[PDB]
C-alpha cells in the first residue's frame, strides 16, 4: 500500500505541476481586419497560429516524454522493491531467478 500510494502521489503531483506551469493568455478572442489591412491580418494569424503550434508541441511531446517518464519509473519501483527485499534477506533465500 505504501509504495503504490507514493507512486500515485508522484503521478498526480507530476500532472498537477505541469498544469500549474501552464498559465497563458485568457481572452484570446478573434480580431477583425479590413480589406486593406491584409498584411496585418496575416501577421496576426501567423502569430496566433505559431503559438498554437508551439503549445501543441509543448503539450504533445510533454506527455510523450512523461509517458516514458512514468512507465520505466514503475519498472524502477519494482526493481527497488525486489532489491530492497533481496537486501533484507541477505543469505536466507534461494534467489529463484524469476523474481521470487
Amino acid at each position, epitope marked *: *500500500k505504501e509504495s*503504490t500510494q507514493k507512486a*500515485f502521489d508522484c*503521478i*498526480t503531483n507530476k*500532472v*498537477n505541476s505541469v*498544469i500549474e506551469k501552464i498559465n497563458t493568455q485568457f481572452e484570446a478572442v478573434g480580431k477583425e481586419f479590413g480589406n486593406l489591412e491584409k498584411r496585418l491580418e496575416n501577421l496576426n494569424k501567423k502569430m496566433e497560429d505559431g503559438f498554437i503550434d508551439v503549445w501543441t508541441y509543448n503539450a504533445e511531446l510533454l506527455v510523450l516524454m512523461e509517458n516514458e517518464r512514468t512507465l520505466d519509473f514503475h519498472d524502477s519501483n519494482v526493481k527497488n522493491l525486489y532489491s530492497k527485499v533481496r537486501m533484507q534477506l541477505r543469505d536466507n533465500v534461494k534467489e529463484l531467478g524469476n523474481g521470487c
Partner: nanobody
Amino acid sequence: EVKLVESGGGLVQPGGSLRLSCGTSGFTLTDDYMTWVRQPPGKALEWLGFIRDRANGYTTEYSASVKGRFTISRDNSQSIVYLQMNTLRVEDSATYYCARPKGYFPYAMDYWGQGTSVIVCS
C-alpha cells in the same frame, strides 16, 4: 485540491423522491470509486454505495439496506453524479456526504464534501 460540492437535500415527505448530486472541482487524476455515504445525526456513519468510471463499466455496489431504495448513477457529460431517493422513510434522515478515494485503489475515503442534510420527520 479538489473541492467536492453537493446539493439536493432538504425537507421531504416520507415516500417521496429527491435528486441528490455531488460534483467535482479541480483536476482529479481519476474519479473512479465515486461513493455516497451518510451519517445520521446519531453519529452512526454508514456507507451507501458506489459508482465507477468508463474503464470498468458504470457498476454500482449498494448497501444491503439500500439495495433497491436509492439509485446511484453518473451523467459523466458534466462530471457530476446523481443519487435518487425513492421510497423514503423516517430512518433516511441523515447528512449525506459525497466521498472518493484518491488512488486508483481503495485505501482511504479521503475527499469529503460539506454534506447535505436530508430530514424525514414523522
